[PDB]
Amino acid sequence: IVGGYTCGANTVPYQVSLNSGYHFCGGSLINSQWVVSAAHCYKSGIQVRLGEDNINVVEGNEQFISASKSIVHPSYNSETYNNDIMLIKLKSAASLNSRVASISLPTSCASAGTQCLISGWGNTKSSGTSYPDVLKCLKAPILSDSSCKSASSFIITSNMFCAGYLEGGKDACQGDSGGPVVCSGKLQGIVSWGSGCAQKNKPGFYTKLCNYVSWIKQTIASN
Ligand SMILES: CC(=N)N1CCC(Oc2ccc(N(Cc3ccc4ccc(C(=N)N)cc4c3)S(=O)(=O)CC(=O)O)cc2)CC1
Ligand SMILES: [Ca+2]
């Protein structure tokens, strides 16, 4: 997260760190046994880390739980990033409390202009790299489809939205991948991709989670 702020320990209780020996992606706890993340974060040997603030220090509220199953969206396209969403089932249910909490799935898509909270342990620099150990947060408005389209050399789909600030300086970044974009208490987005980080006219792109609610509920129900 570039140009954001330190969230505060466990102020984003649905935020998860996916760990394969090191933090590699964020994700969002959507119930006691399931995490949603980006399909581009897929890899084997995932441990889900809940209750994290400082990902390098055991501070007493973590729950570490290995994934028993990952399910990349059936139509995830890694070339176009279409359908960049993955579900991860935990080997055992997380214990939910104030510091570990699920985030609600949306029932309606969010509209342009809506302010959202994006969080993660991704790179904090627009040029070069510095990775924070505590969770970073950024409030960013969803941008219009027209400006998202104008802002990207890549084909954008209806399963993506962009959010951020065209003037640059504030954006998600590498390492925030898979993490939540929450708008009005609903998980509306997943950190998906961007061209560089926090560059002028290059806003972050996010998987439009409201489009996947049926797949998500059906997949969880059947697994
Ligand atoms: C839309 C599309 N067709 N895509 C997505 C973009 C591109 O794929 C990628 C995927 C990953 C990267 N990486 C950077 C990267 C990764 C994740 C991000 C998440 C958000 C944001 C943002 N600003 N909100 C920028 C990000 C930039 S990379 O793999 O780490 C390159 C490397 O190895 O150093 C760079 C390009 C090509 C495929
Ligand atoms: Ca910790």
CSV table of C-alpha atoms and ligand atoms in Angstrom, one decimal:
chain,number,residue,atom,x,y,z
A,1,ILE,CA,0.0,0.0,0.0
A,2,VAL,CA,1.6,3.3,-1.2
A,3,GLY,CA,0.6,6.5,0.5
A,4,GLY,CA,-1.8,4.9,2.9
A,5,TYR,CA,-1.5,4.7,6.7
A,6,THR,CA,-0.8,2.3,9.5
A,7,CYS,CA,-4.2,0.6,10.1
A,8,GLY,CA,-3.7,-0.2,13.8
A,9,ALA,CA,-3.4,-3.7,15.2
A,10,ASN,CA,-6.5,-5.8,14.2
A,11,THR,CA,-8.5,-2.8,13.1
A,12,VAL,CA,-9.1,-4.8,9.9
A,13,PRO,CA,-10.1,-8.1,11.5
A,14,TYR,CA,-11.1,-9.9,8.2
A,15,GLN,CA,-7.6,-9.2,6.7
A,16,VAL,CA,-5.6,-12.3,6.3
A,17,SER,CA,-1.9,-12.8,5.4
A,18,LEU,CA,-1.2,-15.8,3.2
A,19,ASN,CA,2.1,-17.3,4.1
A,20,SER,CA,4.3,-19.8,2.4
A,21,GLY,CA,7.3,-19.3,4.6
A,22,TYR,CA,6.8,-15.6,4.2
A,23,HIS,CA,3.8,-13.3,3.5
A,24,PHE,CA,3.0,-13.4,-0.2
A,25,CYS,CA,-0.6,-12.2,-0.5
A,26,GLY,CA,-3.5,-10.9,1.4
A,27,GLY,CA,-7.0,-12.3,1.6
A,28,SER,CA,-10.3,-11.8,3.3
A,29,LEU,CA,-12.0,-14.0,5.9
A,30,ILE,CA,-15.6,-14.5,4.7
A,31,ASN,CA,-16.4,-17.1,7.3
A,32,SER,CA,-14.8,-19.2,9.9
A,33,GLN,CA,-13.5,-21.7,7.4
A,34,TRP,CA,-13.1,-19.8,4.2
A,35,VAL,CA,-10.8,-17.1,2.8
A,36,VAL,CA,-11.2,-15.3,-0.5
A,37,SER,CA,-8.1,-14.1,-2.3
A,38,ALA,CA,-6.9,-13.5,-5.8
A,39,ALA,CA,-6.5,-16.4,-8.2
A,40,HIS,CA,-3.1,-14.9,-9.2
A,41,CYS,CA,-2.0,-15.6,-5.6
A,42,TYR,CA,-2.6,-19.3,-6.0
A,43,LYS,CA,0.1,-21.6,-4.9
A,44,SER,CA,0.3,-24.8,-2.8
A,45,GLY,CA,1.4,-25.0,0.8
A,46,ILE,CA,-0.6,-22.0,2.0
A,47,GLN,CA,-0.9,-21.2,5.6
A,48,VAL,CA,-3.6,-18.7,6.4
A,49,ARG,CA,-2.6,-16.2,9.1
A,50,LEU,CA,-5.4,-14.4,10.9
A,51,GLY,CA,-5.3,-11.8,13.6
A,52,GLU,CA,-2.1,-10.4,12.2
A,53,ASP,CA,-0.8,-7.0,12.6
A,54,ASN,CA,3.0,-7.2,12.6
A,55,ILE,CA,3.5,-10.2,10.3
A,56,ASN,CA,7.1,-10.7,11.7
A,57,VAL,CA,6.3,-10.7,15.4
A,58,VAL,CA,4.0,-13.0,17.3
A,59,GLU,CA,1.9,-10.4,19.1
A,60,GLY,CA,-0.7,-12.8,20.7
A,61,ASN,CA,-3.8,-12.6,18.5
A,62,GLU,CA,-2.7,-14.6,15.5
A,63,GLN,CA,-4.4,-17.7,14.3
A,64,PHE,CA,-2.3,-19.8,11.9
A,65,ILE,CA,-4.3,-22.3,10.0
A,66,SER,CA,-3.2,-24.3,7.0
A,67,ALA,CA,-5.4,-24.4,3.9
A,68,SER,CA,-7.0,-27.8,3.2
A,69,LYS,CA,-8.1,-26.8,-0.3
A,70,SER,CA,-7.7,-23.9,-2.8
A,71,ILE,CA,-10.2,-23.3,-5.5
A,72,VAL,CA,-9.2,-20.9,-8.3
A,73,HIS,CA,-12.2,-19.5,-10.2
A,74,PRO,CA,-13.2,-22.0,-13.0
A,75,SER,CA,-12.7,-19.2,-15.5
A,76,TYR,CA,-9.7,-17.4,-14.1
A,77,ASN,CA,-7.6,-16.2,-17.0
A,78,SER,CA,-4.0,-15.4,-15.9
A,79,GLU,CA,-3.2,-13.6,-19.2
A,80,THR,CA,-6.1,-11.1,-18.9
A,81,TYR,CA,-6.6,-11.5,-15.1
A,82,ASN,CA,-10.3,-12.0,-15.8
A,83,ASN,CA,-12.0,-13.7,-12.8
A,84,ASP,CA,-9.1,-13.1,-10.5
A,85,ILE,CA,-10.6,-14.8,-7.5
A,86,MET,CA,-9.8,-17.9,-5.5
A,87,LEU,CA,-11.3,-19.5,-2.4
A,88,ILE,CA,-9.2,-21.1,0.3
A,89,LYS,CA,-10.7,-23.5,2.8
A,90,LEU,CA,-9.1,-23.7,6.2
A,91,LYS,CA,-8.2,-27.1,7.7
A,92,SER,CA,-10.0,-26.0,10.8
A,93,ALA,CA,-12.5,-23.2,11.7
A,94,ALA,CA,-11.0,-19.9,12.9
A,95,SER,CA,-12.2,-18.7,16.2
A,96,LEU,CA,-14.0,-15.5,15.5
A,97,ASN,CA,-13.7,-12.6,18.0
A,98,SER,CA,-13.2,-8.8,17.7
A,99,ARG,CA,-9.7,-9.2,16.2
A,100,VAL,CA,-10.6,-12.1,13.8
A,101,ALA,CA,-13.8,-11.5,12.1
A,102,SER,CA,-15.4,-12.3,8.8
A,103,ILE,CA,-16.3,-9.6,6.3
A,104,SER,CA,-19.8,-9.6,4.7
A,105,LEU,CA,-20.2,-10.5,1.0
A,106,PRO,CA,-21.9,-7.7,-0.9
A,107,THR,CA,-25.5,-8.0,-2.0
A,108,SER,CA,-25.2,-5.1,-4.5
A,109,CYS,CA,-22.2,-3.9,-6.5
A,110,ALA,CA,-20.6,-0.7,-5.4
A,111,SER,CA,-20.9,2.5,-7.6
A,112,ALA,CA,-18.3,4.9,-8.8
A,113,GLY,CA,-17.4,7.5,-6.2
A,114,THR,CA,-17.9,5.1,-3.3
A,115,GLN,CA,-15.1,5.2,-0.8
A,116,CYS,CA,-13.5,1.9,0.1
A,117,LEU,CA,-10.8,0.6,2.5
A,118,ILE,CA,-8.0,-1.3,0.9
A,119,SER,CA,-5.4,-2.9,3.2
A,120,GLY,CA,-2.3,-5.1,3.0
A,121,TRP,CA,1.3,-5.6,3.8
A,122,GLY,CA,2.4,-4.8,0.2
A,123,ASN,CA,5.1,-2.5,-0.9
A,124,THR,CA,4.8,1.1,0.4
A,125,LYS,CA,6.9,2.8,-2.3
A,126,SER,CA,5.8,4.0,-5.8
A,127,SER,CA,9.4,3.7,-6.9
A,128,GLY,CA,11.7,1.1,-5.4
A,129,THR,CA,10.6,-1.1,-2.6
A,130,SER,CA,9.9,-1.2,1.1
A,131,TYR,CA,7.7,-3.8,2.7
A,132,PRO,CA,6.0,-2.9,6.0
A,133,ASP,CA,5.5,-5.4,8.8
A,134,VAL,CA,2.3,-3.8,10.1
A,135,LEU,CA,-0.9,-3.6,8.1
A,136,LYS,CA,-1.3,-0.6,6.0
A,137,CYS,CA,-4.6,0.9,4.9
A,138,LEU,CA,-5.8,3.2,2.2
A,139,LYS,CA,-9.2,4.8,1.6
A,140,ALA,CA,-9.8,5.1,-2.1
A,141,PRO,CA,-12.9,5.9,-4.2
A,142,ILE,CA,-14.1,3.6,-6.9
A,143,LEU,CA,-13.4,5.3,-10.3
A,144,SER,CA,-15.9,5.3,-13.2
A,145,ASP,CA,-15.7,2.6,-15.8
A,146,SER,CA,-14.9,5.2,-18.4
A,147,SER,CA,-11.8,6.5,-16.5
A,148,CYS,CA,-10.7,2.9,-15.6
A,149,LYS,CA,-10.9,2.1,-19.3
A,150,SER,CA,-9.0,5.2,-20.3
A,151,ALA,CA,-6.4,4.5,-17.6
A,152,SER,CA,-5.4,1.1,-18.8
A,153,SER,CA,-3.6,-0.3,-21.8
A,154,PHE,CA,-5.0,-3.7,-20.8
A,155,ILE,CA,-8.5,-5.0,-21.7
A,156,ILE,CA,-10.7,-4.3,-18.7
A,157,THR,CA,-13.7,-6.5,-18.0
A,158,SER,CA,-16.9,-6.1,-16.1
A,159,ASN,CA,-15.3,-8.4,-13.5
A,160,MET,CA,-12.9,-5.7,-12.6
A,161,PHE,CA,-13.2,-2.2,-11.2
A,162,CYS,CA,-10.5,0.4,-10.6
A,163,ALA,CA,-10.1,2.5,-7.5
A,164,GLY,CA,-7.7,5.1,-6.3
A,165,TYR,CA,-6.4,8.4,-7.4
A,166,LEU,CA,-5.5,9.3,-11.0
A,167,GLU,CA,-3.0,11.9,-9.7
A,168,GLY,CA,-0.9,9.1,-8.3
A,169,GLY,CA,0.7,8.6,-4.9
A,170,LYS,CA,-1.9,6.4,-3.4
A,171,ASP,CA,-2.6,2.8,-4.5
A,172,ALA,CA,-2.3,-0.9,-3.6
A,173,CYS,CA,0.9,-2.6,-4.7
A,174,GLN,CA,2.7,-5.9,-5.0
A,175,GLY,CA,2.2,-7.9,-1.8
A,176,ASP,CA,-1.3,-6.5,-1.3
A,177,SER,CA,-2.6,-8.9,-3.9
A,178,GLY,CA,-5.6,-10.9,-2.9
A,179,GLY,CA,-6.4,-8.5,-0.1
A,180,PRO,CA,-9.8,-6.8,0.6
A,181,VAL,CA,-11.5,-3.7,-0.8
A,182,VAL,CA,-14.3,-3.1,1.6
A,183,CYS,CA,-17.0,-0.5,0.9
A,184,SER,CA,-19.7,0.3,3.4
A,185,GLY,CA,-18.9,-2.8,5.4
A,186,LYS,CA,-19.0,-5.1,2.4
A,187,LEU,CA,-16.2,-6.9,0.6
A,188,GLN,CA,-16.5,-5.4,-2.9
A,189,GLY,CA,-13.0,-6.0,-4.2
A,190,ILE,CA,-9.9,-8.1,-4.2
A,191,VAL,CA,-6.5,-6.5,-4.9
A,192,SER,CA,-5.9,-7.8,-8.4
A,193,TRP,CA,-3.5,-5.8,-10.5
A,194,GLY,CA,-2.1,-2.4,-11.6
A,195,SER,CA,0.5,-0.9,-13.9
A,196,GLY,CA,3.3,-0.1,-11.5
A,197,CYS,CA,2.0,1.3,-8.2
A,198,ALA,CA,0.7,4.7,-7.4
A,199,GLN,CA,1.5,6.1,-10.8
A,200,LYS,CA,-0.4,9.0,-12.3
A,201,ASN,CA,-3.3,7.8,-14.4
A,202,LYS,CA,-2.6,4.2,-13.4
A,203,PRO,CA,-5.1,3.3,-10.7
A,204,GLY,CA,-5.3,0.0,-9.0
A,205,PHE,CA,-7.6,-2.7,-10.4
A,206,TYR,CA,-9.7,-5.0,-8.3
A,207,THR,CA,-11.7,-8.1,-8.8
A,208,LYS,CA,-15.3,-7.1,-8.7
A,209,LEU,CA,-16.4,-9.5,-6.0
A,210,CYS,CA,-20.2,-8.8,-6.2
A,211,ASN,CA,-20.1,-10.7,-9.5
A,212,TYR,CA,-18.9,-13.9,-7.8
A,213,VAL,CA,-21.2,-14.0,-4.8
A,214,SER,CA,-23.2,-16.9,-6.3
A,215,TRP,CA,-20.1,-18.9,-7.2
A,216,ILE,CA,-18.7,-18.2,-3.8
A,217,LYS,CA,-21.8,-19.3,-1.8
A,218,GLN,CA,-22.3,-22.3,-4.0
A,219,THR,CA,-18.7,-23.4,-3.8
A,220,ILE,CA,-18.5,-23.0,0.0
A,221,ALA,CA,-21.9,-24.8,0.4
A,222,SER,CA,-20.6,-27.7,-1.7
A,223,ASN,CA,-17.2,-28.0,-0.1
B,1,LIG,C1,-4.7,-6.9,-16.7
B,1,LIG,C2,-3.7,-7.9,-17.2
B,1,LIG,N1,-3.9,-8.4,-18.3
B,1,LIG,N2,-2.7,-8.2,-16.4
B,1,LIG,C3,-2.5,-7.7,-15.1
B,1,LIG,C4,-1.2,-6.8,-15.2
B,1,LIG,C5,0.0,-7.6,-15.8
B,1,LIG,O1,0.4,-8.6,-14.8
B,1,LIG,C6,1.2,-8.3,-13.8
B,1,LIG,C7,1.2,-9.1,-12.6
B,1,LIG,C8,2.0,-8.8,-11.6
B,1,LIG,C9,3.0,-7.8,-11.7
B,1,LIG,N3,3.8,-7.5,-10.6
B,1,LIG,C10,3.8,-6.3,-9.9
B,1,LIG,C11,2.4,-6.1,-9.2
B,1,LIG,C12,1.8,-7.1,-8.6
B,1,LIG,C13,0.6,-6.9,-7.9
B,1,LIG,C14,0.0,-5.6,-8.0
B,1,LIG,C15,-1.2,-5.4,-7.3
B,1,LIG,C16,-1.8,-4.1,-7.3
B,1,LIG,C17,-1.1,-3.1,-8.0
B,1,LIG,C18,-1.7,-1.7,-8.0
B,1,LIG,N4,-0.9,-0.7,-8.5
B,1,LIG,N5,-2.9,-1.5,-7.5
B,1,LIG,C19,0.1,-3.3,-8.6
B,1,LIG,C20,0.7,-4.6,-8.6
B,1,LIG,C21,1.9,-4.8,-9.2
B,1,LIG,S1,5.0,-8.6,-10.4
B,1,LIG,O2,4.5,-9.9,-10.7
B,1,LIG,O3,5.3,-8.5,-9.0
B,1,LIG,C22,6.2,-8.1,-11.4
B,1,LIG,C23,7.5,-8.6,-10.8
B,1,LIG,O4,7.8,-9.8,-10.8
B,1,LIG,O5,8.3,-7.8,-10.2
B,1,LIG,C24,3.0,-7.0,-12.8
B,1,LIG,C25,2.2,-7.3,-13.9
B,1,LIG,C26,-0.4,-8.4,-17.0
B,1,LIG,C27,-1.7,-9.2,-16.8
B,2,CA,CA,2.1,-11.2,14.1
